[model samples]
Target chain A: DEDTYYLQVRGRRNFEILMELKRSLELMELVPQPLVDSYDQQQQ
Target chain B: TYYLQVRGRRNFEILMELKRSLELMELVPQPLVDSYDQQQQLLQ
Candidate 1:
């Protein structure tokens, strides 16, 4: 699924904005592993 | 209009795909629109 469907054919400003959004999404996917482990222990 | 606002947040189909590509650092992909014609177009 890595075929080139979209392209980054825009100016510098838009590119920066896009990168910012991208970074934010990446960071949001992170969760505290300790909390997850404690919850898993409780579940067991 | 401000582009980053998601235009009041309704179209879930297009938005999800856009999110995925942006997460992947793919080129600024978006749903089809008429006014903004100078940017990249990533299809889901």
Candidate 2:
């Protein structure tokens, strides 16, 4: 039952971008916290 | 000779599911990989 409940299972491109963005964020401190937070909400 | 070795949060879940989808040929036509380790990291 998905009402007000949604899930975004990433496709290859977006997923790759996410992985890249995450890895990049990890390399730089202070930024990852928020960046990770943003992506953390993408559900499935 | 290849293997589907995935670990790090729910990556294994998709991996196992894909493996089930693979059993026949299992060509690398897609991500063949995914993970929620980073997302879940936020919860803990």
Candidate 3:
């Protein structure tokens, strides 16, 4: 079963930090491939 | 705290990245807390 992961941050800058973490997580193959693709599609 | 949720398979690598990123951003991340049972019951 899939799990729901939660990350808590306090401010706008921290949210940007979260985005950076997303990029690094993608690079490390820590995120699911399809999810990454979905992000890319949304950004495009 | 502003909460961000990602639903997928649980991954230690992703969790590590989140904590490290938060630290680098000078924010203290909360410890890993399980809410699986709460979520499962609520969803059910």
Candidate 4:
């Protein structure tokens, strides 16, 4: 199914921030893999 | 939040499901709350 969602990168000043966001999100996957996945899907 | 999910749509969902599914379970509606979730998740 196709779905719409809202995605935002808050307070991210540069590519570094995007990297941080990705890393942070990935780290989150380690703990609660679904948390990152759900949020990731929510933003998509 | 136990499985990092279990009923993640809403805290209300958790509460409602708990009442419906488990007869002897003491439902603490606070697990999905961010602070508790974080401790359970792996963030400072």
lDDT of 4 by residue, A1-44 (tens): 14535456656586555544433332332344454355447544
**Model 2 segments beyond 4 Å from truth?**
A1-31, A40-44, B24-44
Candidate 3 CAPRI-style tier: acceptable
A1-44 per-residue lDDT for model 2 (tens digits): 11121113334544444445434433444455778677778743
Q: Tens digit of lDDT per residue, candidate 2, span B1-44?
A: 23222223344344444444444333443443323555567678
In terms of lDDT, the best-performing candidate is: 3
Looking at candidate 4 chain B, the ten consecutive residues that score lowest on lDDT are B19-28
Worst 10 residues of 1 chain B by lDDT: B26-35
Ranking by DockQ: 3, 1, 4, 2
lDDT of 1 by residue, A1-44 (tens): 23434447478999887766654444333424564355447644
lDDT of 2 at B44: 86
Which regions of candidate 3 are displaced past 4 Å?
A19-44, B10-16, B24-44
- C-alpha lDDT of residue B33 in model 2: 32
Error of 3 at B37 (Å): 44
On a 0 to 100 scale, what is the lDDT of residue B18 in model 3? 65
Error of 3 at B3 (Å): 0.5
Report lDDT (CA) for all predictions: 0.46, 0.41, 0.60, 0.43
